[PDB]
Design a protein around this ligand. Structure first.
Ligand SMILES: CN(NC(=O)CC[C@H](NC(=O)OCc1ccccc1)C(=O)N[C@@H](CCCCN)C(=O)C(=O)NCc1ccccc1)c1ccccc1
Ligand SMILES: [Ca+2]
Ligand SMILES: [Ca+2]
Ligand code: NA
Ligand code: NA
Length: 453
């Protein structure tokens, strides 16, 4: 089925192709440094290069060739990071949506399924890009002083006379029944199923890890209950950054005449989100229902886990897959596609959904699920020079990276017995303090150093 045909794109060693506007080189450096340190092999290019060019056609041809060449060399990019707004990386009009999309940078072969997990760090200045990066770094390095905010979420079934009861409430209730609850470590599940909505956005200030709104959207707002771009600029959630998902119309229409809601919520300084998932064109009640809960969901009838396929909430909470921000969006789109394949009621079609939904901000983040766990590991006392690999022990599934000065030297995944064989693509030939980073989905990172010589 579509789930086995097009599963989670995450793979290791993690590879990321970055295409950025030339003005962002200095601001982007701390983000590239951290991504290399945590084990991403980066291939970084700018719109001032001959091979990239400055047009949709040249940038797309560049990306497609990089993917195809990487795949031929058993080294396909996993992620595609687009850095800049539409003045530097334009996107193009969707065939189905008639609105801007980044899909065709990611969709390399003939179909409408991406080859890479794509996200856009949309900024209008280096300062706005730094704003996004600082939130990502605090979240991924887990340097926030109030980690308890990670145990809290905000879920809203917004206003619609007919659809709030038929789809909005069943969507949020399914999320709460199976995942956003005390049994999964969430101490505060702020939820608004219907009016009165009064005070529902206060929780974005006090602290939540995740906010999901399903109902009406505009280019610059969650419409009812209302949260505008002007209100996003007045949030006070310093050091308490969230993932937000707007299952609603047009909040991610990132070529709008003003910065769209998804751009503002990620660009705002020391407040708002580290990533946003939303739709560039209108979204639809039926496909958004399946997106969150799974296919085989029925309007006006509460869905259960046994009676639906995998949706975005289900995938998020799988422990061993669908652990990135991009993968949450991917799972939702798979569910909307599966609904069509099995003959459920559909309102607009899968191709439209793959063109519609986007990640703004950093889609490569692995969101925590309530309070992340403390990892176990053993570092060797030394790293002998000129070795093809090193063993590092860490809990099964952890990803280990050895680097220095923001240059990645080697990576490995801990096997089922907790042994990571770190393959050194660059051997250690010089004395120095080498960084060792260990990450795992829903675990706090380990950031240490080993002295050589
Ligand atoms: C943007 N637009 N909306 C539309 O055209 C509707 C698009 C679209 N129609 C739809 O879902 O239809 C389903 C259906 C199929 C078969 C039968 C009956 C229903 C729709 O309502 N989109 C919704 C999101 C629904 C999914 C939530 N999880 C969208 O956010 C929307 O319409 N926003 C408009 C809006 C903007 C500002 C304030 C209020 C409303 C609009 C703008 C101004 C005036 C009227 C419509
Ligand atoms: Ca494809
Ligand atoms: Ca824009
Ligand atoms: Na499901
Ligand atoms: Na998951």
């Amino acid at each position: 089925d579509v789930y086995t045909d097009h599963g989670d794109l995450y793979n290791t060693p993690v590879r990321m192709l970055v295409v950025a506007g030339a003005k962002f080189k200095e601001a982007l450096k701390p983000w590239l440094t951290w991504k290399a340190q945590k084990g991403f092999y980066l291939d970084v290019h700018y719109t001032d290069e001959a091979e990239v060019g400055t047009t949709n056609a040249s940038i797309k041809a560049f990306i497609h060739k990089k993917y195809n060449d990487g795949l031929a060399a058993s080294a396909a990019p996993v992620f595609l990071a687009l850095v800049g707004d539409t003045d530097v990386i334009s996107g193009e009009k969707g065939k189905k949506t008639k609105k801007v999309t980044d899909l065709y940078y990611s969709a390399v072969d003939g179909d409408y399924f991406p080859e890479m997990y794509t996200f856009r760090m949309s900024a209008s200045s280096p300062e706005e890009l730094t704003n996004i990066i600082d939130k990502v770094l605090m979240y991924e390095k887990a340097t926030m002083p109030d980690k308890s905010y990670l145990e809290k979420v905000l879920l809203i079934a917004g206003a619609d006379y007919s659809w709030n009861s038929q789809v909005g409430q069943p969507t949020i209730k399914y999320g709460m029944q199976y995942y956003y609850n005390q049994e999964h470590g969430y101490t505060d599940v702020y939820n608004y199923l219907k009016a009165p909505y009064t005070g529902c956005y206060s929780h974005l200030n006090t602290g939540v890890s995740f906010a999901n709104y399903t109902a009406h959207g505009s280019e610059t707002a969650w419409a009812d209950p209302l949260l505008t771009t002007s209100q996003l600029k007045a949030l006070t959630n310093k050091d308490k950054y969230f993932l937000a998902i707007g299952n609603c119309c047009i909040t991610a229409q990132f070529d709008y005449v003003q910065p769209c809601f998804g751009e503002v919520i990620t660009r705002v300084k020391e407040k708002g989100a580290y990533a946003y998932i939303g739709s560039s064109p209108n979204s639809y009640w039926g496909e958004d229902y399946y997106w969150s809960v799974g296919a085989n969901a029925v309007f006006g009838v509460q869905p259960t886990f046994e009676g639906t396929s995998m949706g975005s909430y289900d995938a998020t909470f799988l422990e061993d897959s669908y652990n990135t921000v991009n993968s949450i969006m991917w799972a939702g789109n798979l569910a909307a596609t599966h609904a069509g394949n099995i003959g459920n009621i559909t309102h607009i079609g899968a191709h439209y959904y793959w063109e519609a939904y986007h990640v703004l901000g950093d889609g490569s983040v692995m969101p925590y699920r309530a309070m992340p766990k403390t990892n176990t590991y053993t570092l060797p006392a030394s790293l002998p020079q000129n070795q093809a690999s090193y063993s590092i022990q860490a809990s099964a599934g952890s990803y280990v990276a050895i680097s220095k000065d923001g240059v990645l030297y080697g990576t490995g995944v801990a096997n089922a017995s907790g042994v990571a064989t770190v393959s050194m693509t660059k051997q250690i030939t010089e004395n120095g303090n080498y960084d060792v980073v260990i990450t795992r989905s829903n675990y706090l990172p380990v950031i240490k150093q080993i002295q050589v010589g």
